[PDB]
Amino acid sequence: ARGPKKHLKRVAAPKHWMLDKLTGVFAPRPSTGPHKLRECLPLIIFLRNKLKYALTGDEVKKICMQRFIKIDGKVRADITYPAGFMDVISIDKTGENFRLIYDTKGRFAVHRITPEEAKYKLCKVRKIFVGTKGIPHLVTHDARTIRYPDPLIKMNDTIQIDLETGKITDFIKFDTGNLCMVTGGANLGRIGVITNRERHPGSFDVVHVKDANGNSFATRLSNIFVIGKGNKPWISLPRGKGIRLTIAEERDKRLAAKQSSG
Amino acid sequence: DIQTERAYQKQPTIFQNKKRVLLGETGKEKLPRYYKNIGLGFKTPKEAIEGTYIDKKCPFTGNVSIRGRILSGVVTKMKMQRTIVIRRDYLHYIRKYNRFEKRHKNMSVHLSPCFRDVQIGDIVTVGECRPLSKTVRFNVLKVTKAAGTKK
Amino acid sequence: GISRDNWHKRRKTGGKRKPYHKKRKYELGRPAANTKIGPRRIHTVRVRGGNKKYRALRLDVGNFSWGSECCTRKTRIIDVVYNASNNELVRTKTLVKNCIVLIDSTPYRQWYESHYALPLGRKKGAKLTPEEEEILNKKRSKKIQKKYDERKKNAKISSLLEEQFQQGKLLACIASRPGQCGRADGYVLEGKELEFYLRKIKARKG
Amino acid sequence: RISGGNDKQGFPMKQGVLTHGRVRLLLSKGHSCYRPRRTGERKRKSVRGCIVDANLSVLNLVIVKKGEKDIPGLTDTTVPRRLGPKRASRIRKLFNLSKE
RNA sequence: AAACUGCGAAUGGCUCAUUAAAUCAGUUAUGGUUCCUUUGGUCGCUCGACUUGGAUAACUGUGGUAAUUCUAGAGCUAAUACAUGCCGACGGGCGCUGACCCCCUUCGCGGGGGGGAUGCGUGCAUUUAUCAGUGGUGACUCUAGAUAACCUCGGGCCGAUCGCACGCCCGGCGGCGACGACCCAUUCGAACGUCUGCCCUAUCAACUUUCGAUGGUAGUCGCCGUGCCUACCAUGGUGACCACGGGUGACGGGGAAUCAGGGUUCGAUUCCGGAGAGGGAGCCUGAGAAACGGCUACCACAUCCAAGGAAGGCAGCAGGCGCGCAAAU
């Protein structure tokens, strides 16, 4: 390869893009943006598979540049725009908004939210920088460079930004006893409380997260998103509240639903 | 003992020609020494603090950083200057015949003159660096003596 | 077609390696600058990323430093006297990094009388004729004379630097690569540098 | 003032060859006798030299000084202006207009 | 329509010739560097024109060669093409030089403390030299700060660009966009390195070594580290735990067949990475190419011709010949 790739095969797509095999050779390669290729979700994939508003690749384009869809308060006219974690998407005419949260399994889930919760967005700070004339800077996980932050924002905190002004309203400090969830790996979408944080000099610093029912698991430092201060979550959690039901309880719940439905 | 070759040897962090009030005695002619903590729980020795050798590839007094892997080995030969060769003996497993084989892969690491109490057979540990030569990639962090040598 | 690969040559064990792919474009090399002296010529070449590197072919002046009291002035290149790498590169007037040259002593001298108000150079038998510095000495107040007196209470330097100042040339070193940025910066040689490189010149020229 | 020309085999002459024959040379963007198909695309062509001799097909001449004997082939009617200037400063320069 | 400008052609597709620690696989690092586009920030921080210049297209007219996606002289004309460039912000701030002025026990002298006109430099991007130690790492010669300068004529930025909807307040003054731009992070990556793992062969037992082999010093070049390459030094480095040399009907892996348990054979072949476009060699443009549906010379082979010259590389899709036991519109 003499340059960057511009195509992407269907079976080379990530599994959480949640496609089929016998439809086409290629898959939608997203345009470059705030999020990585294997951690985002194209707008065409959502509008054509999840919401079922469109069936072909031209109907998605018509809806997309018809100026009907707004992305974090800004209208976007790219059908392969990368949408990732807590990307607030809004439809102005039928009055629906969706928040992208990983569910109990390894995928995205549709989650309708009220507009009052659609005005803000929780996002994770990545690194702290100092500008030219002594301006402190923040680099956010969706590449939002924010000037003049609060002095108590550290490396692995979570800030809440209003989508109309771009400023910080409130923040959550990285500490034990806070509600957390994991973004990537074998664990995905489980909601838990940070207990331990093991420090290894020169490598990945693993942590330990306990679920609300008695389960525990260990993830890396980069696989951390802090969502709450204590037990109350700052956003509306999806169905099941991220408990990671095992296969026996899942089978029992499906059998109970089948017996009750008839 | 120093300044052997056709160019001056210096540490490009400090200034060695500060103008004092007098330029006589009682406060001069003790040059500062540049050193840093390499991290990873390792402690810098006194020979890198009060020494007079000049290097550019020393992990303590130099321009090289320590990151990546931490290995170990046994010193085999000290023939070429300012760098040594160590031997790593490891066991390889075969799935068919459920029995091991020992293998050795000797490779060259860098020895600063800070560790000059080194004989053949001493156990050393090394840390990964940027390529300092064609085949040299590692810097010795500490030295451990072998059995015997009580003198 | 000059390459910079690490597969034209033998391995660590001494056995030859067989090349499998030809010369690439990131693997590139260019001929040497051979930065001479004379009227200034500088060429630009486009490199990877679309950036430009200034190839200094000839140059006249340089921005050197004199660190005993931290002054920097633009100074003309006079002559190269020593190179630690090649003994042919002094016979051809070439400029490299960490090279040993002579530069003119006029602007540092003017800074020395204009700051410390002591005569520098001006050998005995010929005094200050064009009558400019004692004009600056006069029409001052008592506070300003007290400030100069407290400043020139300590006005001593090395005797070898003084002898270079009567000689009119200061032995200088280059700390910049002229084939990459296009300029010839650096600092003047002082202290043990002067005695070491003067020993080297007197050993080579003997 | 003689300028340009075509060879008997049909090769136009490049200005500055300083040869009475045919020399092959490389041509690039911004040179005569070459219209590039790709950007930066250089191809070697064969041109006629500058010095005129008997082995030529045509020759292009211009008129620099008008005499008194008008030729019906050359000076018969004055053509009208196909299209004039477009920029505002060119109109103000041609009509010698002021600021107001 | 045409044509100038800008962007893409470096993606995709086909093949397995080379290649046996080389490629590749898992695991690390760039604290050792470039990055088109998108996303976010910066874009009156610098103290010094109510819009400038001439050239070319397309077009018109006139020609040569047997011949090409071949082209010269003549007459106009545009830019988000090529260039040259101002006003405002902008009245005073920050540092050196400072004529000088004012207050006092100390009589003045000597000392202590405040105003300072004038003159020079000012920020970001590059380079050198010195000093101190807002924020961070396991760890900087890290970022930020200060001083003195530099700032390439083939030259860093600080908008001489375009459209829609209408306008309030006495000619000034406004809303949403499109394009372009130094720097910074991000996205797509690429590239160089760390640890481990490849088929057979001793009728290959020693190999490399001023034609760099091993390391040190200082440089050149390269986007960066590094014998990558120069000048000088010491004789180093690998090897019976199989180096080296040869062969391969060898691209590597995810995988396929058979299979009680262990294994044996294959993997040219749809997804990943690598290599090439007859085979070596060199290069323009471009962010990214040693590109071949880009260019330049060599040999093998080969097309047209008025014999002067001109034009090419189906291991792309169909198709044809040869080769064949063997493979389609």
Curated annotation (Swiss-Prot), chain A:
Record-linked Gene3D superfamilies: 2.30.30.30, 2.40.50.740, RNA-binding S4 domain (3.10.290.10)
Protein family: Belongs to the eukaryotic ribosomal protein eS4 family.
InterPro entries noted in UniProt: KOW, Rib_uL2_dom2, Ribosomal_eS4, Ribosomal_eS4_C, Ribosomal_eS4_central_region, Ribosomal_eS4_central_sf, Ribosomal_eS4_KOW, Ribosomal_eS4_N
GO CC annotation terms, alphabetical: cytosolic ribosome; cytosolic small ribosomal subunit; nucleolus
Ion transport found in the keyword field: no
One Gene Ontology MF term: rRNA binding
Major site of localization recorded for this protein: cytoplasm
General function of this protein: Component of the small ribosomal subunit. The ribosome is a large ribonucleoprotein complex responsible for the synthesis of proteins in the cell. Part of the small subunit (SSU) processome, first precursor of the small eukaryotic ribosomal subunit. During the assembly of the SSU processome in the nucleolus, many ribosome biogenesis factors, an RNA chaperone and ribosomal proteins associate with the nascent pre-rRNA and work in concert to generate RNA folding, modifications, rearrangements and cleavage as well as targeted degradation of pre-ribosomal RNA by the RNA exosome.
Taxonomic superkingdom: Eukaryota
Keywords in alphabetical order: Acetylation, Cytoplasm, Isopeptide bond, Nucleus, Ribonucleoprotein, Ribosomal protein, RNA-binding, rRNA-binding, Ubl conjugation
Lineage: Eukaryota, Metazoa, Chordata, Craniata, Vertebrata
One of the GO biological process terms: translation
Gene name of the encoded protein: RPS4X
Name of the molecule in the record: Small ribosomal subunit protein eS4
From Swiss-Prot, chain B:
Localization (cell): Cytoplasm; Nucleus, Nucleolus
CDD domains attached to this UniProt entry: Ribosomal_uS17
Lipidation sites (S-palmitoyl cysteine): 58
Any GO MF annotation of the entry: structural constituent of ribosome
Modified residues (Phosphoserine): 65, 108
Record-listed Citrulline modification sites: 20
Disulfide bonds: none
Gene3D superfamilies with a match to the protein in the record: 2.40.50.1000
Biological process according to GO: translation
Alphabetically ordered keywords of this record: Acetylation, Citrullination, Cytoplasm, Lipoprotein, Methylation, Nucleus, Palmitate, Phosphoprotein, Ribonucleoprotein, Ribosomal protein, RNA-binding, rRNA-binding
Residues recorded as bearing Omega-N-methylarginine in the entry: 67
One Pfam family, short name: Ribosomal_S17_N
One GO location term (cellular component): nucleolus
Modification(s) after translation: Citrullinated by PADI4.
In-chain residues carrying the UniProt-annotated modification N6-acetyllysine: 36, 43, 56
Role summary: Component of the small ribosomal subunit. The ribosome is a large ribonucleoprotein complex responsible for the synthesis of proteins in the cell. Part of the small subunit (SSU) processome, first precursor of the small eukaryotic ribosomal subunit. During the assembly of the SSU processome in the nucleolus, many ribosome biogenesis factors, an RNA chaperone and ribosomal proteins associate with the nascent pre-rRNA and work in concert to generate RNA folding, modifications, rearrangements and cleavage as well as targeted degradation of pre-ribosomal RNA by the RNA exosome.
Subunit structure comment from the entry: Component of the small ribosomal subunit. Part of the small subunit (SSU) processome, composed of more than 70 proteins and the RNA chaperone small nucleolar RNA (snoRNA) U3.
Sequence similarity: Belongs to the universal ribosomal protein uS17 family.
PANTHER family found in the cross-reference section: 40S RIBOSOMAL PROTEIN S11 FAMILY MEMBER, SMALL RIBOSOMAL SUBUNIT PROTEIN US17
Gene designation per UniProt: RPS11
From Swiss-Prot, chain C:
Gene3D superfamilies recorded: 3.10.290.70, Ribosomal protein S8e, subdomain
Record localization: Cytoplasm; Membrane; Nucleus, Nucleolus
Disordered: region residues: 1-26
GO cellular component, one term: ribonucleoprotein complex
Lipid moiety-binding residues (N-myristoyl glycine): 1
Modified residues (Phosphothreonine): 129
UniProt keyword annotations, A-Z: Acetylation, Cytoplasm, Isopeptide bond, Lipoprotein, Membrane, Myristate, Nucleus, Phosphoprotein, Ribonucleoprotein, Ribosomal protein, Ubl conjugation
Residue numbers of N6-acetyllysine PTMs: 36, 127
Molecular function per GO: structural constituent of ribosome
A Pfam family: Ribosomal_S8e
Annotated crosslink Glycyl lysine isopeptide (Lys-Gly) (interchain with G-Cter in SUMO2) location: 169, 192
Primary location: cytoplasm
Biased composition (Basic residues): 7-25
Keyword Cytoplasm listed: yes
Keyword Nucleus: yes
Family membership noted in the UniProt record: Belongs to the eukaryotic ribosomal protein eS8 family.
Its biological purpose: Component of the small ribosomal subunit. The ribosome is a large ribonucleoprotein complex responsible for the synthesis of proteins in the cell. Part of the small subunit (SSU) processome, first precursor of the small eukaryotic ribosomal subunit. During the assembly of the SSU processome in the nucleolus, many ribosome biogenesis factors, an RNA chaperone and ribosomal proteins associate with the nascent pre-rRNA and work in concert to generate RNA folding, modifications, rearrangements and cleavage as well as targeted degradation of pre-ribosomal RNA by the RNA exosome.
Identification of the protein by name: Small ribosomal subunit protein eS8
Organism: Oryctolagus cuniculus (Rabbit)
Gene behind this protein: RPS8
UniProtKB/Swiss-Prot annotation, chain D:
Compartments (UniProt record): Cytoplasm; Nucleus, Nucleolus
Entry comment on modification after translation: Ribosomal protein S6 is the major substrate of protein kinases in eukaryote ribosomes. The phosphorylation is stimulated by growth factors, tumor promoting agents, and mitogens. It is dephosphorylated at growth arrest.
Coiled coil: none
Modified residues (Phosphoserine): 98
Role of this protein: Component of the 40S small ribosomal subunit. Plays an important role in controlling cell growth and proliferation through the selective translation of particular classes of mRNA. Part of the small subunit (SSU) processome, first precursor of the small eukaryotic ribosomal subunit.
Subunit structure: Component of the small ribosomal subunit. Part of the small subunit (SSU) processome, composed of more than 70 proteins and the RNA chaperone small nucleolar RNA (snoRNA) U3.
Family of this protein: Belongs to the eukaryotic ribosomal protein eS6 family.
Name this protein carries in UniProt: Small ribosomal subunit protein eS6
Record organism: Oryctolagus cuniculus
Gene: RPS6
Residues of the full protein shown: 51 to 150 of 249
